[PDB]
């Protein structure tokens, strides 16, 4: 037991391989869904049958402080015209010891949206560019 | 209790040259076309015809007659994409190798038996949707035209119709519960047509049928009605 | 129920009193199947289309894609040339290691409807 | 659910090893075909012809001690040697029906006394009463005559067990090799019907009113009036209905308990009991406590409700179908090891 | 492995005067129309005809016939804009040069061959959608009308249909696996029509058939069926 | 709008695509939408 | 499978014994193309449509538009005037440096399945 | 597809592995059919049987006409990079090597049989030294069926996972003169292997395909005799009635039961040569517990993609491959030899 | 569903509604919806 090794939501490690995107700073929305189909039996009141049908992986929003290395992301996104590349990503959650609690690796990524910084003279914060990521499956 | 059991297969459309002489099976292969994405949904339909006049001398409902059996139909959906290699002509070339299925093949015109090539939609163990069929209509939609004019994404529908493969070229055992009159009703439908059964076999006494004997019931050729 | 007729067996032999053997009934249909499936669609030039075309599916990858084409190759041939039989499914299976394909056709003469499987007794 | 077991003499093949066959050609490759007039060859053929893709055969005798207690009409338990007698079927846990074709060929040939053949059938019944899932099919003396078979059941044997089925009149089957009618017991043929049932309408429907195809004629035809002196006592019958071939009439087990008379209920329960014990395999595992007893109740309930889904249960709604109880009340604190008890229900009888 | 490789090209519509005499290729160019916006989507269809009666003497499915092959079709979408120079007549003038493709042309009308001009949809390496075609219908929508009446934004639909370009104006090496009877089946489809092959070649002994020889298989003109 | 007519019968002796004939040219069409209003001065009959 | 015939040769020559030499086979169909592509649609007034309107496209910009029109030009002509040949793709490639356009045509005599490319050896 | 050929030809650059893409390109380089050299005939079948690329190693001119280096060149040449089989070392694209010419030396008597064995055995060492290419071996002419089985098991006995053998020669058809000539099947078989590159993928074993270019087969083999040849790693070519000439058998020249079938080896050399191109993180980055994590993901994201096209048993990606690149497979004693990993792939044939 | 036919010609010599005649009775009709599934045993061929 060793007083267990509980999960946490601060220590992590977010990275994208391939183009020199580097390490990100915040994940969101990592989710897998299936699309159940509801067929209602006519002669048996009481419930609707639930039958599984396919699985579907939702998009992921990754955020990081606006660093001068943001030119790489715009280069990657605007490379669709001349040919794109799908590198392999990773999303890992850690405890403060630096050990591993669960490691997910995105099979193939693809940019979807890039919400840039929201400049504002009165708001004291730090610009957080958002890079949405498309998905193809988990790794194992 | 399976074959490959645990493998993934890709549906492929097989094109065959039309038969030339007094033959029904499709000729040799001319081009085998493998899909880029298996169809999402496949639709199979079949229709029958039954003419039914509503009148009579008594205006009661009239028993309809079977006129004919319409052929089967299928509505594929072929999707092709090369969006990860823009500027390539894989999709445009592939489609141009698919529109062969709507024009007379050059070999047939030589033999004065013009016909567009026959196709077969073979996919794994999908026995229901694998028959000798021709191509009716090919509606194609093009999207995301890559630079320099080459198309990249194309959706091609299909209408397939099954071509019949016809021309594949009555001993009974008497059981304790079976009698000559019942035998006539079982296969002929006329209660008092039993006389024909004893005629072919030469059975004289219709009341001594040996349990386990063999009887030969002729076809209806003795009663053309 | 369907008449089966009589004809000489595949391996023909002298018989009990000499002459030539002669077999009918449920055994005869098996012999006709043995002839039909074994021969290639050739070697019989006067009748070219006869003979199951199974050799076109040799050295395929082990997939149910080729295991499905053979499933349909037998159906057309077992029906066109042998009409006195009704066919009840075929079974492609790799029963030894995973480099061979066994077919287990189940048939039953019409009306008699007793299921049997062709065995190819050597 | 449908696989069958047969015990009899057959030329060649392994001796006293319960081999598995699935097709008639597989059988003939091991133990000949009709040679010597052994009844097992005919009985299996009727079973294979009458549907049923699985079959287990226990060859004991041989071509020619041709017949005795263990050799011939096998009766010995074999001292649980897993290789002799009915003990060979003990290490299967798949066979759902057993029959004894040759058991009474000795009676016709005089090698076994009637009082000697009573015990072996009873020994077979003790086998079915032990494994708790299979059902044995019993066959009566040949040419017994209608008015005398009723005496025979209630005086000679009097089995009175919830795992035996009896079918009185024999069958004049047809041998395709020679086209000659021969007399055979209906143990093999009836077992064929029970195989069709599960594979065509489920275990729910009682195995009766089905064509005994493979048959030609019936010795000692029974009229309806004579049948009503036979059916209630626990004996089935086979009759030749005019224009409908040969059909099996009667689905009553060889038991006197009024709650287990009908065949399908016993056929159902063996399927039902064997379904859950295959499922709920939490044994020599998962700590016995107030938590597990709640887990068992949900797991059984989630299955019986699904069983009501296909019919075969009564109540118009799941709540009135079964009644499960696996709470602390049934498990006293004293039951340290002999614990994890539960109750359950199922019923949908026939006409 | 490319030509221009890395350039962008604007699709243009080429209009040609109709052929006058016993000719099939379109005549000289009369006006070349360059687009202002390449089409977003480009639909190509194709239809075939197969009449199939459902009846017979036995009312089984009947093998259908091949009545004919319908021509190819396209549906472009033509866009024009001058919204950065309102009051200009670039769009109105451009559409005028586009409506020449639905009326007869004076030169042809003189030669008593009244046909409207032919068009070709040239766009880069788009070989599938480039053929001699005539314009069927032109439905035009006008929007964003600039002051003083000149239109500015016009959407023009097109329906194109392919014009056929027809009239483009038997030796076999015997292999060890081949035989005379099989060769008749390969090209003629009749197993016992092998006599024709030996007749033209003049071989008298069908037994040998030396490997590597050259055989001339005449057309079906010897068997008109 | 603008329409043209070209008949084309696929039937032939070789069943290849047949060169169509220019049957004729349909006339031009136009669909306006005229709007009239007097709601600023109700009770008047300018629009009627 | 298609018969190829025999005939003269473009650069004609006395031969081994005299007269003029006649060449057949795959070499011949290679000679017919050389005549077809070289001559402009003219310079033979009795047969005007024969030739190849390659030259009217000279001096166009080096775009896929020029390359696109090239493909359609060769495809129609090779089909119209030389029917003993099946044509398998035409390749337009920049040569030295964005300067000249190389037309590479892959072909095969019908029914033979012998891929081949026109070379035009001077 | 890139095949390699070693032969004597009339003219052309010597011991320089030039590239040819069309039959006409050959003619300008090294003539055609002059002198009865087998290299000109052998490549013709390869070009006619599909395959748009080829490499030629010219050694031995028209007429030391034949020797170990001159003619059937075999020397590594002290890695001179332009002599013998060493010329192919600096290519890294060639995936098919064949030696048609040397057997003319056996027919013309310029070489001894024991000298032939060394040349081909040296070739096998070349294939084993590299990791991708597969060599095609030819048997002595007119060997006779009951004697070729003895020849393989006694004379050569190669037993390597990089060689293929094809017994009966091919009576090819020369279009220049229309005369049947005998040629080894090394060139023609390589043509089939090129067809599978383009159509049906590298998955399907190169068998049951027409050896188009062929006319007749010397010493026809019956099925009963063939079944004494297939299990011992010898292919065969037969004249199936009404089906032309087809290649029967897809067994490589190895005895290891896990590598008997040809397509498996054809797959693996393709598979290994694909990932190593993909994962070029060498002489780059820092060997640590982070990089070993990425390598596992990069390989997995490809093998899963290799399952999309089939050619991987399992019904699900997780049942196809198994990749383990964690810390415990790289000990703390990395010694720069670290970055180790495993992988799987399997789908053999009938 | 269920349909009946009653022809009725409005015209007459008096131009009043005319009594229609029962031409005939059409047959009954029914449209089921057959649903089959084996999604909990993928790879099986029960549905096909």
PDB file of C-alpha atoms in Angstrom, chain G:
ATOM      1  CA  UNK G   1      -2.528  -9.792 -79.282  1.00  0.00           C
ATOM      2  CA  UNK G   2      -3.176  -7.047 -81.812  1.00  0.00           C
ATOM      3  CA  UNK G   3      -1.642  -7.577 -85.237  1.00  0.00           C
ATOM      4  CA  UNK G   4       1.067  -4.996 -85.916  1.00  0.00           C
ATOM      5  CA  UNK G   5       1.781  -5.510 -89.617  1.00  0.00           C
ATOM      6  CA  UNK G   6       4.862  -4.383 -91.494  1.00  0.00           C
ATOM      7  CA  UNK G   7       5.956  -1.443 -93.580  1.00  0.00           C
ATOM      8  CA  UNK G   8       8.781   0.905 -94.442  1.00  0.00           C
ATOM      9  CA  UNK G   9      10.886   2.872 -91.945  1.00  0.00           C
ATOM     10  CA  UNK G  10      11.178   6.620 -91.393  1.00  0.00           C
ATOM     11  CA  UNK G  11      14.917   6.974 -92.066  1.00  0.00           C
ATOM     12  CA  UNK G  12      14.869   4.624 -95.033  1.00  0.00           C
ATOM     13  CA  UNK G  13      17.951   2.845 -96.250  1.00  0.00           C
ATOM     14  CA  UNK G  14      19.178   0.338 -98.781  1.00  0.00           C
ATOM     15  CA  UNK G  15      19.325  -2.671 -96.473  1.00  0.00           C
ATOM     16  CA  UNK G  16      21.416  -5.842 -96.446  1.00  0.00           C
ATOM     17  CA  UNK G  17      21.002  -6.885-100.088  1.00  0.00           C
ATOM     18  CA  UNK G  18      19.448  -3.859-101.789  1.00  0.00           C
ATOM     19  CA  UNK G  19      16.086  -2.281-102.395  1.00  0.00           C
ATOM     20  CA  UNK G  20      14.583  -0.806 -99.241  1.00  0.00           C
ATOM     21  CA  UNK G  21      14.341  -2.471 -95.852  1.00  0.00           C
ATOM     22  CA  UNK G  22      10.984  -3.244 -94.248  1.00  0.00           C
ATOM     23  CA  UNK G  23      10.635  -3.479 -90.474  1.00  0.00           C
ATOM     24  CA  UNK G  24       7.821  -4.904 -88.360  1.00  0.00           C
ATOM     25  CA  UNK G  25       7.036  -5.740 -84.753  1.00  0.00           C
ATOM     26  CA  UNK G  26       7.370  -3.459 -81.754  1.00  0.00           C
ATOM     27  CA  UNK G  27       9.934  -1.402 -83.657  1.00  0.00           C
ATOM     28  CA  UNK G  28       7.371  -0.506 -86.328  1.00  0.00           C
ATOM     29  CA  UNK G  29       4.713   0.957 -84.036  1.00  0.00           C
ATOM     30  CA  UNK G  30       7.543   3.028 -82.620  1.00  0.00           C
ATOM     31  CA  UNK G  31       8.181   4.505 -86.081  1.00  0.00           C
ATOM     32  CA  UNK G  32       4.564   5.429 -86.776  1.00  0.00           C
ATOM     33  CA  UNK G  33       4.492   7.621 -83.675  1.00  0.00           C
ATOM     34  CA  UNK G  34       7.639   9.479 -84.718  1.00  0.00           C
ATOM     35  CA  UNK G  35       5.960  10.553 -87.954  1.00  0.00           C
ATOM     36  CA  UNK G  36       2.710  11.374 -86.162  1.00  0.00           C
ATOM     37  CA  UNK G  37       4.208  13.626 -83.495  1.00  0.00           C
ATOM     38  CA  UNK G  38       6.815  15.371 -85.653  1.00  0.00           C
ATOM     39  CA  UNK G  39       4.530  16.846 -88.310  1.00  0.00           C
ATOM     40  CA  UNK G  40       2.489  19.929 -87.480  1.00  0.00           C
ATOM     41  CA  UNK G  41      -1.235  19.963 -88.337  1.00  0.00           C
ATOM     42  CA  UNK G  42      -0.455  21.071 -91.866  1.00  0.00           C
ATOM     43  CA  UNK G  43       2.370  20.504 -94.382  1.00  0.00           C
ATOM     44  CA  UNK G  44       0.179  17.744 -95.864  1.00  0.00           C
ATOM     45  CA  UNK G  45      -2.845  19.648 -97.155  1.00  0.00           C
ATOM     46  CA  UNK G  46      -4.736  16.591 -98.405  1.00  0.00           C
ATOM     47  CA  UNK G  47      -4.910  15.360 -94.782  1.00  0.00           C
ATOM     48  CA  UNK G  48      -5.002  18.481 -92.603  1.00  0.00           C
ATOM     49  CA  UNK G  49      -6.153  17.064 -89.265  1.00  0.00           C
ATOM     50  CA  UNK G  50      -3.201  14.655 -89.204  1.00  0.00           C
ATOM     51  CA  UNK G  51      -0.303  15.804 -87.044  1.00  0.00           C
ATOM     52  CA  UNK G  52      -0.033  17.285 -83.568  1.00  0.00           C
ATOM     53  CA  UNK G  53      -0.846  20.882 -82.622  1.00  0.00           C
ATOM     54  CA  UNK G  54       2.072  20.925 -80.220  1.00  0.00           C
ATOM     55  CA  UNK G  55       3.645  24.024 -81.749  1.00  0.00           C
ATOM     56  CA  UNK G  56       0.697  26.371 -81.240  1.00  0.00           C
ATOM     57  CA  UNK G  57       1.351  25.949 -77.500  1.00  0.00           C
ATOM     58  CA  UNK G  58       5.055  26.849 -77.703  1.00  0.00           C
ATOM     59  CA  UNK G  59       6.060  29.929 -75.669  1.00  0.00           C
ATOM     60  CA  UNK G  60       3.186  29.604 -73.226  1.00  0.00           C
ATOM     61  CA  UNK G  61       4.087  30.066 -69.550  1.00  0.00           C
ATOM     62  CA  UNK G  62       5.476  27.066 -67.703  1.00  0.00           C
ATOM     63  CA  UNK G  63       2.395  26.233 -65.658  1.00  0.00           C
ATOM     64  CA  UNK G  64       0.314  23.139 -65.130  1.00  0.00           C
ATOM     65  CA  UNK G  65      -2.100  24.846 -67.528  1.00  0.00           C
ATOM     66  CA  UNK G  66       0.334  24.389 -70.403  1.00  0.00           C
ATOM     67  CA  UNK G  67       1.150  20.918 -69.096  1.00  0.00           C
ATOM     68  CA  UNK G  68      -2.564  20.197 -68.807  1.00  0.00           C
ATOM     69  CA  UNK G  69      -3.334  21.136 -72.404  1.00  0.00           C
ATOM     70  CA  UNK G  70      -0.367  19.022 -73.503  1.00  0.00           C
ATOM     71  CA  UNK G  71      -1.873  15.855 -72.039  1.00  0.00           C
ATOM     72  CA  UNK G  72      -5.170  16.357 -73.844  1.00  0.00           C
ATOM     73  CA  UNK G  73      -3.424  17.159 -77.123  1.00  0.00           C
ATOM     74  CA  UNK G  74      -1.303  14.008 -77.295  1.00  0.00           C
ATOM     75  CA  UNK G  75      -4.111  11.789 -75.993  1.00  0.00           C
ATOM     76  CA  UNK G  76      -6.610  12.617 -78.738  1.00  0.00           C
ATOM     77  CA  UNK G  77      -4.122  12.413 -81.609  1.00  0.00           C
ATOM     78  CA  UNK G  78      -2.504   9.116 -80.615  1.00  0.00           C
ATOM     79  CA  UNK G  79      -6.004   7.677 -80.327  1.00  0.00           C
ATOM     80  CA  UNK G  80      -7.280   9.093 -83.617  1.00  0.00           C
ATOM     81  CA  UNK G  81      -4.456   8.323 -86.035  1.00  0.00           C
ATOM     82  CA  UNK G  82      -2.638   5.312 -84.531  1.00  0.00           C
ATOM     83  CA  UNK G  83      -5.176   2.766 -83.245  1.00  0.00           C
ATOM     84  CA  UNK G  84      -2.887  -0.282 -82.932  1.00  0.00           C
ATOM     85  CA  UNK G  85      -1.587   1.115 -79.627  1.00  0.00           C
ATOM     86  CA  UNK G  86      -2.925   1.568 -76.107  1.00  0.00           C
ATOM     87  CA  UNK G  87      -1.598   4.705 -74.407  1.00  0.00           C
ATOM     88  CA  UNK G  88      -0.581   4.626 -70.727  1.00  0.00           C
ATOM     89  CA  UNK G  89      -0.147   8.140 -69.285  1.00  0.00           C
ATOM     90  CA  UNK G  90       1.808  11.128 -70.592  1.00  0.00           C
ATOM     91  CA  UNK G  91       4.453  12.782 -68.429  1.00  0.00           C
ATOM     92  CA  UNK G  92       5.376  16.463 -68.671  1.00  0.00           C
ATOM     93  CA  UNK G  93       8.491  17.340 -66.700  1.00  0.00           C
ATOM     94  CA  UNK G  94      10.703  20.393 -66.485  1.00  0.00           C
ATOM     95  CA  UNK G  95      14.100  19.595 -67.944  1.00  0.00           C
ATOM     96  CA  UNK G  96      17.230  21.667 -67.425  1.00  0.00           C
ATOM     97  CA  UNK G  97      15.858  24.619 -65.421  1.00  0.00           C
ATOM     98  CA  UNK G  98      12.243  25.847 -65.736  1.00  0.00           C
ATOM     99  CA  UNK G  99      12.994  26.134 -69.449  1.00  0.00           C
ATOM    100  CA  UNK G 100      11.801  23.235 -71.625  1.00  0.00           C
ATOM    101  CA  UNK G 101       8.972  20.724 -71.335  1.00  0.00           C
ATOM    102  CA  UNK G 102       9.712  17.028 -71.799  1.00  0.00           C
ATOM    103  CA  UNK G 103       6.796  14.895 -72.975  1.00  0.00           C
ATOM    104  CA  UNK G 104       7.231  11.295 -71.815  1.00  0.00           C
ATOM    105  CA  UNK G 105       4.594   8.922 -73.196  1.00  0.00           C
ATOM    106  CA  UNK G 106       4.260   5.357 -71.931  1.00  0.00           C
ATOM    107  CA  UNK G 107       2.458   2.965 -74.252  1.00  0.00           C
ATOM    108  CA  UNK G 108       1.874  -0.680 -75.140  1.00  0.00           C
ATOM    109  CA  UNK G 109       0.474  -2.507 -78.150  1.00  0.00           C
ATOM    110  CA  UNK G 110      -3.072  -3.570 -77.345  1.00  0.00           C
ATOM    111  CA  UNK G 111      -3.377  -6.873 -75.514  1.00  0.00           C
ATOM    112  CA  UNK G 112       0.378  -7.416 -75.161  1.00  0.00           C
ATOM    113  CA  UNK G 113       1.037  -5.678 -71.806  1.00  0.00           C
ATOM    114  CA  UNK G 114       4.586  -4.617 -72.683  1.00  0.00           C
ATOM    115  CA  UNK G 115       5.046  -1.145 -71.176  1.00  0.00           C
ATOM    116  CA  UNK G 116       7.236   1.063 -73.340  1.00  0.00           C
ATOM    117  CA  UNK G 117       8.053   4.745 -73.736  1.00  0.00           C
ATOM    118  CA  UNK G 118       8.704   6.763 -76.867  1.00  0.00           C
ATOM    119  CA  UNK G 119      12.306   7.954 -76.900  1.00  0.00           C
ATOM    120  CA  UNK G 120      12.686   9.772 -80.250  1.00  0.00           C
ATOM    121  CA  UNK G 121      16.380   8.837 -80.767  1.00  0.00           C
ATOM    122  CA  UNK G 122      17.285  11.915 -82.810  1.00  0.00           C
TER     123      UNK G 122
END
